[PDB]
């Protein structure tokens, strides 16, 4: 998702009081709306409960290096929460897939949709489920009757872009409290008038 030619407020994204986890690196979480950026990139995917700790810069594993790499200069904002009552069902919900095998590493902010069979041995298989060849794409194990570390989690990352462009999507001037009957200073779009 790309956010452009829009204006938004992150205050309503925080008072939901329903997110199980929230991490924001590169900027202080209370002082991001006033700061203005150029573009906002949002990616949405599902993940298990034991892999939410893997979405961080500076570690190696199975999902964070084969599906979406996190670079060192990562000023993103990752938000995840539990919605296991809608994305899972009885009888085994295997609609979501994931990649387990890869030939080598991948560049960050790159998507891998290769469905070729990964070869482990030194002999070709020509697309067969035999020896020295296994499918890199595998099914999930989601179930609504699981515990807490293996449920389907809805994780999204909000990243910011800093280029030589004017601000496009950023927090506007905050509506402060209205005061009356006092000698105060105000600016209603056309004058800096001081008075009651």
């Amino acid at each position, epitope marked *: 998702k790309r956010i452009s030619n829009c204006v938004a407020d992150y205050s309503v994204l925080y008072n939901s009081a329903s997110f199980s986890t929230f991490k924001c690196y590169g900027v202080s979480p209370t002082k991001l709306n006033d700061l203005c950026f150029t573009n906002v990139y949002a990616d949405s995917f599902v993940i298990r409960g034991d892999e939410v700790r893997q979405i961080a810069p500076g570690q190696t594993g199975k999902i964070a290096d084969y599906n979406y790499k996190l670079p060192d200069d990562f000023t993103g904002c990752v938000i995840a929460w539990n919605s296991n009552n809608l994305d899972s069902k009885v009888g085994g919900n295997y609609n979501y897939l994931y990649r387990l095998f890869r030939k080598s590493n991948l560049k960050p*902010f790159e998507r891998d949709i290769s469905t070729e069979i990964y070869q482990a041995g030194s002999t070709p298989c020509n*697309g067969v489920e035999g020896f020295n060849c296994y*499918f890199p794409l*595998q099914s999930y194990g989601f179930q609504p009757t699981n515990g807490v570390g293996y449920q389907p989690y809805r994780v999204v990352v909000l990243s910011f872009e800093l280029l030589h462009a004017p601000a496009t999507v950023c927090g506007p001037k905050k509506s402060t409290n209205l005061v009356k009957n006092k000698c105060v200073n105000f600016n209603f779009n056309g004058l800096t008038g001081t008075g009651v």
Partner: antibody
Amino acid sequence: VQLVESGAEVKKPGSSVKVSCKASGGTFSSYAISWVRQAPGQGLEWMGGIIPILGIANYAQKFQGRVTITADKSTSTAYMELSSLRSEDTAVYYCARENGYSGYGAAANFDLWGRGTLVTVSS
Amino acid sequence: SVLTQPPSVSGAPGQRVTISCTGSSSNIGAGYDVHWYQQLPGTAPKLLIYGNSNRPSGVPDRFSGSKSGTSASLAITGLQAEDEADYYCQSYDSSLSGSVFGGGTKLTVLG
């Protein structure tokens, strides 16, 4: 390889159509298989794609739970089940193949296509 | 739907004919690659160019694909006796959660 599909088929407005997608040779039990519909008067649409390896369905949000696609590994064929036909089913289906790659874009490219099934329904 | 295409384009047999495809910022302008297909009236469509950077086997080099940011363009050199078909834009749409095709352009002047 080449994909061979059946000819024209005519059903009733409210019945179920049964067509098949045959594959000659190999490279059918290794890649994802989808279906493409072209309608004279509008653009092309994509109902969904089915992976034959794990047997996992992947449809689109524009289509409800009415069309179901199954896959077979013994004879390397696919079957299409579609019930509750409406007045605007006069189009042609295509059996396509998907070959993924690596890159910044990572878009689904349709390199291999089928023959076509002229499925028309009316009074 | 989300992809709009011109109804028809005029050209001459010997000059450059360029088509322009415009979509949204979530399907083509997000960063996804585009695919172009030719819809011959009577034969099944085939793959022409994928990713606008590689050339598939059996496809001539006269077709060129480029992505100018949010819009993708296709340019050809010379009108032969097989361009009487329709050109479509195919790109992955995140909002639709699938692939969506374009409108289609007819290439004929007078015969």
